[PDB]
Amino acid sequence: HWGYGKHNGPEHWHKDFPIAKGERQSPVDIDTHTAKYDPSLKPLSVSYDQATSLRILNNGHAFNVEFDDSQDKAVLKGGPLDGTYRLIQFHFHWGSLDGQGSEHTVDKKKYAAELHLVHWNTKYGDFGKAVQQPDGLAVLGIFLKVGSAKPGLQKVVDVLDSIKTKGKSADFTNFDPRGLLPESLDYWTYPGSLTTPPLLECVTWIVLKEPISVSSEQVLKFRKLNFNGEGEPEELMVDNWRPAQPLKNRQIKASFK
């Protein structure tokens, strides 16, 4: 099955998921000089004060912090979006080295990691229905660079020892995702896809201009996770990123000049 290795990595995904070669695949390189400022874009509305985190799970490809999405508790609105998108989970993609790890790139520059806060359009009733719709998901993408520690990330880092291997989960209540946000909510936006199989073309991507900084110790702890299950041969969970895909007939819009 699919993964990030030599024999099952992103270049192989199209054999099981032909949409991998589709018209609105993600991630992409954000060429900052050719992105178009759109003054009709609204400021993002990130309403996370009532967020209810539940658990953290190693799914064999990343780790997901999952939220109660049965009510409008943590929602994303505004920006390019119509309607209300509920936060369901966040996860990261990261590298084996500080110079790689992000999925989106900025003028071909790769960041050490990329955070994806995944939201679904409440008009579709549940996440499973939303992924079947062209406007079903909104993913807020935030780049991570290595520098000073991010205090709001530390509670995530400290639980990773409990979910080292695929299939492990741990309780993870009362986590506040506002501690993962940069100061500015300036963003680029474009229509795209899930970056992992099934690669469905259901995502309005909103990628923040301002990265967050995390410490070397914080990212090193990401790199100690395992793709494998307990008792299977150990393979470090690193480089779980898909490279940039062709932009094709899309224009990236910017909320800022």
Q: How far is the CB of 40 from ligand N7V (least distance, A)?
A: 26
Which structure tokens are listed for 231? 């008792």
The closest alpha carbon to 88, from 16, 159, 36, 140, belongs to: 140
**Applying CB under 6 A, does 116 fall inside the site for ligand N7V?**
yes
Count of residues engaged in binding ligand N7V, rule: CB under 6 A:
10
Q: Is 14 assigned to a binding site? A: no
Q: How far is the CB of 86 from Zn ion (least distance, A)?
A: 17
Q: How far is residue 140's CA from residue 131's CA, in Å, rounded to a whole number? A: 16
- For ligand N7V, which stretch binds (CB under 6 A), given 57-65, 70-78, 175-183, 227-235? 57-65
Q: Is 93 assigned to a binding site? A: yes
For 161-197, b/e burial (b = at least 16 CB within 10 A) is: eebbbbebbeebeebebeebbeeebebbbbbbbbbbb
**Applying CB under 5 A, does 116 fall inside the site for Zn ion?**
yes
Q: Which segments within 164-252 are labelled E, that is strand? A: 169-171, 187-192, 203-208, 212-214
Sign of the torsion formed by the C-alpha atoms of 57, 73, 144 and 202 = positive
**Applying CB under 6 A, does 196 fall inside the site for ligand N7V?**
yes
Q: Is 119 assigned to a binding site? A: no
Residues paired with 138 in a beta bridge: 119, 204
Q: Residue 61 catalytic? A: yes
Q: How far is the CB of 49 from ligand N7V (least distance, A)?
A: 23
Catalytic residue among 14, 61, 104, 119: 61
Give the residue ranges of the annotated binding site.
Answer: 91, 93, 116, 195-196
Binding site for ligand N7V (CB under 6 A): 59-61, 116, 118, 139, 194-197
